[PDB]
Amino acid sequence: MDLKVVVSLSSRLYTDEIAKMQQRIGCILPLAQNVQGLGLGQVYSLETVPDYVSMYNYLSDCTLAVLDEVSVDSLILTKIVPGQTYAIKNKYQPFFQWHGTGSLSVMPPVFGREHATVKLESNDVDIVFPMVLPTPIAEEVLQKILLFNVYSRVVMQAPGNADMLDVHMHLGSVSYLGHHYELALALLDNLSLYFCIMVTLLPRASMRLVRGLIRHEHHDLLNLFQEMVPDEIARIDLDDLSVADDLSRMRVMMTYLQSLASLFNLGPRLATAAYSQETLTATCWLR
Amino acid sequence: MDLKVVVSLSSRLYTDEIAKMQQRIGCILPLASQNVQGLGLGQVYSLETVPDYVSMYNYLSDCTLAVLDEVSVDSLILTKIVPGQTYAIKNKYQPFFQWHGTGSLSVMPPVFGREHATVKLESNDVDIVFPMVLPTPIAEEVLQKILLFNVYSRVVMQAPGNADMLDVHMHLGSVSYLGHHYELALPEVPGPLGLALLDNLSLYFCIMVTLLPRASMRLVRGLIRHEHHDLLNLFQEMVPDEIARIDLDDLSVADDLSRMRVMMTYLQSLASLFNLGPRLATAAYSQETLTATCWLR
Amino acid sequence: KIHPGVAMTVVRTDEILSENILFSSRASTSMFIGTPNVSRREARVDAVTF
Amino acid sequence: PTIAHGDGRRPSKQRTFIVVKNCHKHHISTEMELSMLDLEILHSIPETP
Amino acid sequence: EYRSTVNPWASQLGSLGDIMYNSSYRQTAVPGLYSPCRAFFNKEELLRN
Amino acid sequence: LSAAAVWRAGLLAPGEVAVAGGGSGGGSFSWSGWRPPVFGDFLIHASSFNNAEATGTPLFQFKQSDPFSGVDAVFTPLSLFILMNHGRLTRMANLLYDSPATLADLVPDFGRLVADRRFHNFITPVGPLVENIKSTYLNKITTVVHGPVVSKAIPRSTVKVTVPQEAFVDLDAWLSQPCPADARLYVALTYEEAGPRFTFFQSSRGHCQIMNILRIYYSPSIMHRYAVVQPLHIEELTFGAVACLGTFSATDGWRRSAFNYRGSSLPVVEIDSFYSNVSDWEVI
């Protein structure tokens, strides 16, 4: 069974595209085929701000594919089935880790726009790979950039309550299995907007649901042991507000927790089996 | 590998229903493992029970789905759903949903009314209702709508001066789509398993309300005191008293990391709760002939 | 209907369906023809695609 | 080929353009669907008409 | 050859005509729509010609 | 016969083949399908191993925090359980191993990793062991990490999977007919004030709906927590995590056999025709 997909280049290339694709011959890439609708070049385009959540939804929408070989006119790549296995190398702008790691993420590149982006002047497609990076690395990085955007926007909001040095000593540094890596920097502004409006509507939603579900069961041991948990000040105000706007706030609460719930899942979850360190390649299969 | 699973009936299927089973070809039906009863959704959603859409959700999620492609008299052929094969599914359901989104597909109980998915079978003592097939965003929106309705209709019934019963049935009401609004079927009592789902959801809620990152509070206060965003329209230029009284403390960063750590893990647990019911990944839904190659995710 | 202080230059776009006439001289292009190859894109148990 | 000029204005040398040309590769593709049971009944052998 | 431009608000580098339809100042617009005058005021297609 | 006459199509070659024409399409003769799994080879310390244990045992790799170590040892839930009993069924556990010292100091911190209650994301399951050489130093093992269980050699023997019965809890026997075709096997971490535990769950239901029934079963274990302790330094609100080990065939049920040491007897649940698939950790 042949899963190989040739992408026909419109224009002839020269040696720099060869050197960059053979610099990037391991990494993976989305799909729709056509040369234009190939990578994240429809979502990292500079005609708009390259947003995060739409980029995530587009990446999870189309299937994924690994590049294999580049010629002058062809771009030989192979896509991914969840049936069989494949190979994967790093060849990335950060060279982080593959420490036997039983779960792998495919995140959009949040370190730098041009760090993954192989820019070609002969064809204005400006193809750009997603970052392949292991799963606790990916969760720590998304945490430390989300809080970085919240802290940057709150120090842009008011410079009194936040600083930058004690968070650069804290959240600019990622560390995992004896490796200490470094990362610093408007897509995360929209992400933190979703995160802040979620955690803002969360008290009203939680207290409304616990007042709904509080005494359905008339004596449960679990029910009491979970209702002595919450904050004693998080349980005052419900009946001051009406029904309609409250239920609209419930609706937007629910759709936003669903969207962010799939988003804090790490996207297309690849899985590795046996990583050969002396070769820099891993045996992979979609899961 | 085999996919062809034949199911015999037990008596002569009458010729009035072979026409509509010819009309329902390529739809989805839930399996039992054969026999005749339970091969469908009538055994757990009957007329007698108030439709909770959660126990039948338990049955459709817990059982492997099946495509119905050929109907004959006294014998009809089924095809199971096994991961790794790209099944051809036709959207043949009377609440129409074009798959212009071409996203992941989702199966749901017949929440769009009993009549649209039923079929009478006067041969044997079995009736068949069909599971609904519908895209991911509409499915999760209708899922959160039916849970919010079965949790708030009961508390509206708990009101003594329940002056407005029809408020939620017209504000919550129909489903959100750009083509049309499609009114659904609404239970009055949530049933046991629905309150079990709201129980586990409220358990996650009261666990997650114990940890809120305090920097985000400052951000929403500042944006309220900035221009009122279009996303900020739900506040209509108001700071709630609760966020005003949980900001008596200052902005830190040490508790923020472990707060966000447990928030990632509990949001992934909540996603695992809401990724419930079997899911289909779609490659290239063809528009002109209403068929879609899909494999089980 | 009072004139403002400024003047405006509207610019429209207008797509027009036009039949062109294509000429090319004899032997203007050399061409290499490849022999076709049949391959299985996806092995579906209901219907294999070629 | 160049003319040789009447007045000796400028020397008319050989002008040999040495030009290289690129091969434009195109990969034409489609698909054709075949049902599995048709392939099965292809591989079987006939006995009854 | 007797005047520089007939209009000042659409001819210089930071004129109103550029900041409406440049690629360099449309950094927050939706890429779905079309603009007619974007076929003139873009810098990249100007320097490509 | 006509069965031998119709045998030419159903002989071999999954998929099919266009026998002639202008082009040849499809070649799958002399290969009967049945996708072979990829092999996750590991090199463990022989002092971290027991040779006497059987082949088909589900293993658990703890990933080394150390950069200057090409090797990595493994944990089995017997070894893991006696490691919890050393960090603080026992008579079974001491019967296997003599010294828990190199295993407890093998991981650098073990009381700290249960203090932060982050033990789940550091233990990556690699499924059942199959291939095993025997050496006094740096012993190399190989496990079927994803797919069907099989031996390495050209005798491609099925390997029955031994899961200990005392550490295994049935789901449907304690719950007392949605889908008897799928049979899935889950492992679950479990914290406790005394010492943590690893347990196993057979389930005939789907993967996503199994956690909510696991909470209903698991609720008397969580009703004992929080009466005597209250978490500071905030961790510990998580109470166990579950993952998928893979599926097996419910047509042939698990048949209990006898994995015996020379000391005493020890019954074991044998899983035959297991289709290994390690998923991600899902907390409760």
Query: Is F12 within 8 Å of F32 (Cβ atoms)?
Result: yes
Q: b/e for A19-38, b at 16 or more Cβ within 10 A?
A: ebbeebebbbbbbebeeeeb
Report the alpha-carbon distance of residue F245 to residue F110 in Å, rounded.
24
Cβ atoms of F256 and F267 closer than 8 Å: yes
Which chain F residue has its CA at the smallest distance from C46's CA? F15
CB B53 within 8 A of CB B132: no
* Residue matched to tokens 């266009």: F18
Phi, psi dihedrals of residue F86, rounded to the nearest 5°: -90, -25
Closest CA to F182 of B35, A67, A260, B80: B80
Query: At F153, which helix (H) or strand (E)?
Result: none
Instruction: Return the number of CB contacts < 8 Å for A and C.
Output: 7
CB pair distance less than 8 Å for F15 and C36: no
| SS3 call for A130 | coil
Residues C32 and D14: beta-carbon distance below 8 Å: no
What are the C-alpha distances in Å from B15 to residues B20, B72, B121, D12, F130? 9, 10, 10, 97, 57
CA–CA distances in Å: residue B80 to residues B85, B87, C43, F277 = 10, 10, 17, 21
**Of B191, B157, B151, B169, which Cα lies nearest the Cα of B52?**
B191
**Minimal Cα distance from B38: which residue of F?**
F178
F34 Cβ contact partners less than 8 Å away, ≥ 6 residues apart: F148
Q: H-helix or E-strand containing A48?
A: none
Of the candidates B19, B23, B136, B7, which has an alpha carbon nearest to the alpha carbon of residue B80?
B7
Kindly report the number of other CB atoms within 10 A of residue B133's CB atom.
23
Q: CB of A106 within 8 A of CB of A94?
A: no
Please tell me what DSSP assigns to residue D33.
B
Report how far residue A109's alpha carbon sits from residue B6's, in angstroms, rounded to the nearest whole number.
49
CB-based contact, E36 to chain C, within 8 Å: yes
3-state secondary structure (DSSP) of residue D30: coil
Residues B196 and B202: beta-carbon distance below 8 Å:
no
What residues of C are in contact with residue E36 (Cβ under 8 Å)? 11-13
Q: What does the DSSP assignment read for F94-108? A: HHH-S--HHHHTTSS
- Cα separation, C21 vs C47, in Å, equals 44
Residue A190 CA to residue A150 CA, distance in Å, equals 10
C15/B63 Cα distance (integer angstroms): 55
Biggest distance spanned by C-alpha atoms of chain E:
41
Taking the C-alpha atoms of residue F66 and residue F44, their distance in angstroms, rounded to an integer, is 14
| Type of residue found at A218 | H
Number of CB atoms found within 10 A of residue A119's CB: 15
Q: Hey, CA dihedral for F28, F31, F32, F36, is it positive or negative?
A: negative
**Amino acid, single-letter form, for residue B23:** Q
Contacts of F33 in chain B (CB under 8 A): 1
> Shortest Cα distance from F103 to chain B (angstroms)?
29
CB atoms within 10 A of CB B99: 18
Containing F241, the helix (H) or strand (E) segment is strand F241-249
* CB burial readout F110-147, b (16+ within 10 A) else e: beebbeebebbbebbbbbbbbbbeeeeeebebbbbbbb
Count CB atoms within 10 A of the CB of residue C14: 5
Q: What are the angstrom distances between the C-alpha of F201 and each of A42, A272, D31, F243?
A: 46, 25, 46, 10
Residues of C contacting chain E (CB within 8 angstroms): 9, 11-13
Q: How wide is the angle at C-alpha A173 spanned by C-alphas A172 and A176, nearest 5°? A: 150
**Does D39 contact chain C (CB < 8 Å)?**
yes
What three-state secondary structure class fits A285? strand
Residue B296: enclosing H or E segment and its boundaries? strand B291-296
Phi and psi, residue B239, nearest 5°: -95, 125
In the structure encoding, which two tokens stand for residue C43, read together?
């092995």
Residue pair D34/C50 in contact (Cβ under 8 Å)? The answer is yes
CB proximity E33 to C under 8 Å = no
Which of B1, B5, B82, B86 is the best substitution to test chain C (most C C-beta atoms within 10 A)? B86
What is the C-alpha radius of gyration for chain A, rounded to an integer number of angstroms? Answer: 23
Q: What is the CA radius of gyration of chain B?
A: 23
Beta-sheet strands, E only, within B112-250? 118-119, 128-129, 132-135
Residue type, B161: G
What the block records as the tokens of B61 is 């999620």
Q: From the CB of residue D10, how many other CB atoms can be counted at a distance below 10 Å? A: 7
DSSP helix, strand, coil percent of chain B (3-state; round to 5): 35, 20, 50
Among residues A97, A99, A174, A89, the alpha carbon closest in space to that of A129 is found at: A89
- Sort out which chain A residues have CB atoms less than 8 A from B144's CB and list them: 251, 254-255, 258
Helix, strand, coil in percent for chain A, rounding step 5: 35, 20, 45
* CA separation for the pair B131, B144 (Å, rounded): 18
Q: List D residues 3-42 in contact with F (Cβ-Cβ < 8 A).
A: 36, 39-40, 42
Phi and psi torsions of A117, nearest 5°: -75, 110
CB F98 within 8 A of CB F47: no
Q: What is the C-alpha separation between A163 and B190, in angstroms, rounded?
A: 50
DSSP state of B161: T
Query: Which residues, 6 or more positions from B16, have their beta carbon under 8 angstroms from its beta carbon?
Result: none
**Helices A135-157 & B214-224 angle (0-180, nearest 10):** 40
Euclidean distance between CA atoms E28 and E22, whole angstroms: 12
Is B185 buried (19+), middle (13-18) or exposed (0-12) by CB count in 10 A? middle
Tokens of B177: 């789509």
CA distance A174 to A154: 22
Task: Write out the two tokens for C21.
Answer: 């006439």
Q: C-alpha angle with apex F282: B87 to F162, nearest 5 degrees? A: 85
Are the CB atoms for F178 and B60 separated by under 8 Å? no
What is the Cβ-side half-sphere exposure of residue A179, based on CA atoms within 13 angstroms?
14
Nearest to A185 by CA among A243, A134, A236, A109: A109
User: Chains contacting A with at least 3 CB pairs below 8 Å?
Assistant: B, C, D, E, F
Closest residue by Cα to residue F238 from A227, B194, B258? B258
Q: Which among F177, F209, F284 has the least Cβ separation from residue B58?
A: F209
Q: Number of C-alpha atoms within 13 angstroms, CB side, residue D45?
A: 10
Resolution reached, in Å? 4.2
CB-CB neighbours of B192 under 10 Å: 12
The continuous run of DSSP H or E covering B214 comes out as helix B214-224
Paired tokens of A252: 């937007």
Rounded to whole angstroms, how far apart are CA atoms F74 and F61? 5
Give the 3-state secondary structure of residue D16: coil
**Cβ atoms within 10 Å of A279's Cβ, excluding its own:** 9
Taking Cα atoms as reference points, which of B212, B248, E30 lies closest to residue A150?
A: B212
Spatial distance between the Cα atoms of F66 and F88, rounded to a whole number of angstroms: 24
- Side-chain-side CA neighbours of B203 within 13 Å: the count stands at 22
**Token pair in block for residue B115:** 């009549």
Alpha carbons A223 and F33: distance in angstroms, whole number: 52
Chains B and E, touching by 3 or more CB pairs within 8 angstroms: no
Cβ(F114)–Cβ(F87) under 8 Å?
Answer: yes
Which residue type occupies A36? Q
What the block records as the tokens of F95 is 């019967």
**Distance (Å, whole) CA B46 – CA B42:** 5
